[PDB]
Amino acid sequence: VLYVGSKTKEGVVHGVATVAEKTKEQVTNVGGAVVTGVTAVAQKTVEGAGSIAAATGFVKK
Amino acid sequence: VLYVGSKTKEGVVHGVATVAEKTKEQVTNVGGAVVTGVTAVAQKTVEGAGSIAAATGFVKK
Amino acid sequence: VLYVGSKTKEGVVHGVATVAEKTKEQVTNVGGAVVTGVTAVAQKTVEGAGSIAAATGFVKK
Amino acid sequence: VLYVGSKTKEGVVHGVATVAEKTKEQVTNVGGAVVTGVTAVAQKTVEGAGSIAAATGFVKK
Amino acid sequence: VLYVGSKTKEGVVHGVATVAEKTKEQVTNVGGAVVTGVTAVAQKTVEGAGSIAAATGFVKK
Amino acid sequence: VLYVGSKTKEGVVHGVATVAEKTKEQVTNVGGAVVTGVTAVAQKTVEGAGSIAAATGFVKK
């Protein structure tokens, strides 16, 4: 059970913001979900052995 | 059980903000979920042996 | 059981801020979830033996 | 069992902030979740032998 | 069991702040969660033998 | 069992603050959770044999 209650008169929200002017490379990486709103809720469940999540910005070999 | 209650007149929110001007490389890396709002709630459950989370900025080889 | 109650008139919030100008390699890395709001709540559970979390900025091999 | 209550007229909050002008390499690494708000709450459970958390800035081999 | 109460007219809060100019390898590293707010609460539970947390700024091999 | 109470007219709070300019290898490592606020509390539970905290500034080999 999850309850979330919310009331708002004025709401200004910015989730993920990126600016890149003259850079050679820029990377913005997110492994899970991205969730944004004046009321914002996120849930996740994983079941079973040996589960893996491997969020990486970059690789050079 | 989780209860969250919230009431707001004026709310201003910034979650993840990145600026990069002349940098050769820039990386913003996030393993889990990213959740943002005037009211913001996040929950996660992982069950079973040997599970791995490996959030990495970069590798050079 | 967790209860969170919250009432606010004027509120301003910044979660993660990064700015980078003439730098060679800037990295902002986060292992868990990222949660930001006027009211902001985060919960996590992991069950079962030998689980590993390994949040790393970078590797040069 | 956790209870949190809060009332605020004016609130200004900054969680994690990083500035990088002319630096060669620069790392902000966080192992856990990051939680920020006019009211902010974080909870974590690990159950199981031999569990590891290894949050590291960088390695040069 | 924990109770926290809080009432605030004016609050200004800065969590983790980092600034760098001509520096070559500035690191900010944190092992646990980072929690910040006009009211701010953090709780952590580990249950099981052999459990390790090993938060490291850097290594040069 | 714990209780915490708080009423504040005006409060200005800085948690972990870092500045550096010409320095070669400045490191801000922290081995626990980082918690900061006009009211701020942190608690931690570790149960079972063999439990290790191994927070490290840096290693050179």
Swiss-Prot record, chains A, B, C, D, E, F:
Keywords, alphabetical: Acetylation, Alzheimer disease, Amyloid, Cell projection, Copper, Cytoplasm, Disease variant, Membrane, Metal-binding, Neurodegeneration, Nucleus, Parkinson disease, Parkinsonism, Phosphoprotein, Repeat, Secreted, Synapse, Ubl conjugation
Region (4 X 11 AA tandem repeats of [EGS]-K-T-K-[EQ]-[GQ]-V-X(4)): 1-31
Entry binding sites for Cu cation: 14
Post-translational modification: Phosphorylated, predominantly on serine residues. Phosphorylation by CK1 appears to occur on residues distinct from the residue phosphorylated by other kinases.
Keyword field contains Isomerase: no
Cellular localization per UniProt: Cytoplasm; Membrane; Nucleus; Synapse
Cellular component, GO, one term: mitochondrial inner membrane
Tissue spec. comment: Highly expressed in presynaptic terminals in the central nervous system. Expressed principally in brain.
Entry-annotated residues carrying Phosphoserine: 51
GO biological process terms, semicolon-separated: adult locomotory behavior; amyloid fibril formation; behavioral response to cocaine; cellular response to copper ion; cellular response to epinephrine stimulus; cellular response to fibroblast growth factor stimulus; cellular response to oxidative stress; chemical synaptic transmission
Superkingdom, natural source: Eukaryota
Sequence repeat placement: 6-20, 21-31
Molecular function terms, GO-annotated: actin binding; alpha-tubulin binding; beta-tubulin binding; calcium ion binding; copper ion binding; cuprous ion binding; cysteine-type endopeptidase inhibitor activity; dynein complex binding
Quaternary structure and partners: Soluble monomer. Homotetramer. A dynamic intracellular population of tetramers and monomers coexists normally and the tetramer plays an essential role in maintaining homeostasis. Interacts with UCHL1. Interacts with phospholipase D and histones. Interacts (via N-terminus) with synphilin-1/SNCAIP; this interaction promotes formation of SNCA inclusions in the cytoplasm. Interacts with CALM1. Interacts with STXBP1; this interaction controls SNCA self-replicating aggregation. Interacts with SNARE components VAMP2 and SNAP25; these interactions allows SNARE complex assembly and integrity.
Family statement: Belongs to the synuclein family.
Disorder this protein is connected to according to its UniProt record: Genetic alterations of SNCA resulting in aberrant polymerization into fibrils, are associated with several neurodegenerative diseases (synucleinopathies). SNCA fibrillar aggregates represent the major non A-beta component of Alzheimer disease amyloid plaque, and a major component of Lewy body inclusions. They are also found within Lewy body (LB)-like intraneuronal inclusions, glial inclusions and axonal spheroids in neurodegeneration with brain iron accumulation type 1.
Domain observations: The 'non A-beta component of Alzheimer disease amyloid plaque' domain (NAC domain) is involved in fibrils formation. The middle hydrophobic region forms the core of the filaments. The C-terminus may regulate aggregation and determine the diameter of the filaments.
Functional description taken from the UniProt entry: Neuronal protein that plays several roles in synaptic activity such as regulation of synaptic vesicle trafficking and subsequent neurotransmitter release. Participates as a monomer in synaptic vesicle exocytosis by enhancing vesicle priming, fusion and dilation of exocytotic fusion pores. Mechanistically, acts by increasing local Ca(2+) release from microdomains which is essential for the enhancement of ATP-induced exocytosis.
Protein name stated in the entry: Alpha-synuclein
Organism the protein comes from: Homo sapiens
Shown chain mapped onto the complete sequence: 37 to 97 of 140
